[PDB]
Design a protein around this ligand. Structure first.
Ligand SMILES: [Zn+2]
Lengths: 76, 316
């Protein structure tokens, strides 16, 4: 299926995934498509944090859902 | 004239100590491998004279001590002890001053984030399931936070000196907190696709990423619908002691009597620095060991905490 990832700037990318795909793997498709290192990526769904070690199916992500990409903060 | 007895105890979990006696000259790890003393990897060293009436740390062995370990830490990770100890060596050196009625942490090894965490927990009606974290926590509220801080790093897979996200760190911690009676109920209203209701429990009941305003989540935030229109999400029922609203750092106004506490993130796409804001008889800005009071504040807020008991909505 295809899903959408909306960036912080509001730019929307189309991704090609499967409900078996992991969050890790989803980040790899993003990296491949927008050059963003996976260790910077954090995936949000309608406000809900998608845990790094999990799968789309765990969070019932449907065809054409929109995911939000936020950044891992690096505070000292 | 002498003896090969130094008399020290070995354990995994502070509480129950075991006893294994070795020679005065027999080193620790040549026989029991990974062994620690207050963090000091004493794997390769000779027993001494001061080593008496004390306690030691080791990896579990007889698959019973792995149960004795789990029933204190709530983890099956064997690397946990090492990452906890390698980090306790540094944390024990930090200073924990009482700023504004709360236990803070002096700037060191990029611990500003750990400081927000600790500062906010002491304001929230919350308890830990893991015994390690609840005992370390009790001492932490009293000024003894070296172990709490080391724990946090260990549960978060973060090393000392490493930069950190307060929201992510709070998340690792709430995994081990009691939030089983935490309940959030959301409606999403699409003009075409209809109204969906969903229920959330546990950590996910109290976290949100997209707005700092608890009031916005009650009057409706805008999310994409699967059909291509925008829909409206809104809180219908919340049952928890607190909520944590979070959003990418952005300028926000903080005025007393509308929130509990919060934290700001000044920086950019790479580095950054957290300071903590709490509300008392006025606003307290707490950066590490430094306090400042102000009537009002505006700046790069990223998380806000709000007190909650029970809430139901006035919509549909
Ligand atoms: Zn729709």
């Amino acid at each position: 299926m295809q899903i959408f990832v909306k960036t912080l700037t509001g730019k929307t990318i189309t991704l090609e995934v499967e409900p078996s795909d992991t969050i890790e793997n989803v980040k790899a498709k993003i990296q491949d498509k927008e050059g963003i290192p996976p260790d910077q990526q954090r995936l949000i769904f309608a406000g809900k944090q998608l845990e790094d070690g999990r799968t789309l199916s765990d969070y019932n992500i449907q065809k054409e859902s929109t995911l939000h990409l936020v950044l891992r903060l690096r505070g000292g | 004239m002498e003896v090969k007895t130094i008399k020290v105890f070995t354990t995994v979990d502070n509480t129950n100590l075991h006893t294994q006696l070795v020679d005065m000259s027999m080193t620790y790890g040549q026989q029991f491998g990974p062994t620690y003393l207050d963090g000091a990897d004493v794997t390769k060293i000779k027993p001494h004279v001061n080593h008496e009436g004390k306690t030691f740390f080791v990896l579990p062995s007889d698959d019973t001590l792995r149960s004795e370990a789990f029933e204190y830490y709530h983890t099956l990770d064997e690397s946990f002890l090492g990452r906890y100890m390698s980090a306790l060596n540094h944390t024990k050196k930090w200073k924990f001053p009482q700023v504004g009625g709360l236990t803070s942490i002096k700037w060191a090894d990029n611990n500003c984030y750990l400081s927000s965490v600790l500062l906010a927990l002491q304001q929230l009606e919350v308890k830990f399931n893991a015994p390690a974290l609840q005992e370390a926590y009790y001492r932490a509220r009293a000024g003894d936070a070296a172990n709490f801080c080391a724990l946090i790093l260990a549960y978060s897979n973060k090393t000392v000196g490493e930069l950190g996200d307060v929201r992510e760190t709070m998340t690792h911690l709430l995994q081990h907190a009691n939030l089983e009676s935490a309940k959030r109920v959301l409606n999403v209203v699409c003009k075409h696709c209809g109204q969906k209701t969903t229920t959330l429990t546990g950590v996910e009941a109290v976290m949100y990423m997209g707005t700092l305003s608890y009031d916005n989540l009650k009057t409706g935030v805008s999310i994409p619908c699967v059909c291509g229109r925008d829909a409206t999400q809104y809180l219908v029922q919340q049952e928890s002691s607190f909520v944590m609203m979070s959003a990418p750092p952005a300028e926000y106004k903080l005025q007393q009597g509308t929130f509990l506490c919060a934290n700001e993130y000044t920086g950019n796409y790479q580095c950054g620095h957290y300071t903590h804001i709490t509300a008392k008889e006025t606003l307290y800005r707490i950066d590490g060991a430094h306090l400042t009071k102000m009537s009002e504040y505006k700046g790069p807020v990223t998380d806000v905490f709000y007190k909650e008991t029970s809430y139901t909505t006035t919509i549909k």
